[PDB]
Design a protein around this ligand. Structure first.
Ligand SMILES: [Ca+2]
Ligand SMILES: [Ca+2]
Length: 81
């Protein structure tokens, strides 16, 4: 039958991935760049270099536009290896 609260629909769809994108973003505009990503990366303990970040954007970018967005993230996260 039909429920009220409906706590069965617990499927990890793209709806949940949309949040992961905002985490990486700095100002939450919808796109990510080496400069922006370099900021969030600074929080990490290890000392990453500007060159090391280029690798993250290289494989992270699928539209060869230079930045990463929801469409790119959903594609990058949906099977990185
Ligand atoms: Ca952004
Ligand atoms: Ca792209």
């Amino acid at each position: 039958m039909v429920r009220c609260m409906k706590d069965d629909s617990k499927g990890k769809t793209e709806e949940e991935l949309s949040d992961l994108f905002r985490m990486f973003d700095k100002n939450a505009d919808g796109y990510i760049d080496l400069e922006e990503l370099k900021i969030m990366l600074q929080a990490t303990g290890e000392t990453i270099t500007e060159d090391d970040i280029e690798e993250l954007m290289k494989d992270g970018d699928k539209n060869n536009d230079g930045r990463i967005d929801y469409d790119e993230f959903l594609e990058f996260m949906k099977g990185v290896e």
